[PDB]
Write a protein that binds this DNA or RNA. Sequence first.
DNA 1: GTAATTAC
DNA 2: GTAATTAC
Length: 59
Amino acid sequence: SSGKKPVKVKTPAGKEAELVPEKVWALAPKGRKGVKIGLFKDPETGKYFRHKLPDDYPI
DNA sequence: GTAATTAC
DNA sequence: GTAATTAC
């Protein structure tokens, strides 16, 4: 599932950016709350990276 | 090491 | 095939 709303993230280049994730999903071991992860592209470097999403972000 | 995901 | 992502 693709993302909808922009997320405030820290990029691997060390900049804060509000980005729309390309893909979002839950990362949780069995019986654990886990986290939500987004796949982002750094808007300046083109580098793909993964970053935590707010706990209540739509998947 | 687990959990899913995908760029690399 | 593996890195990288978080919290446990």
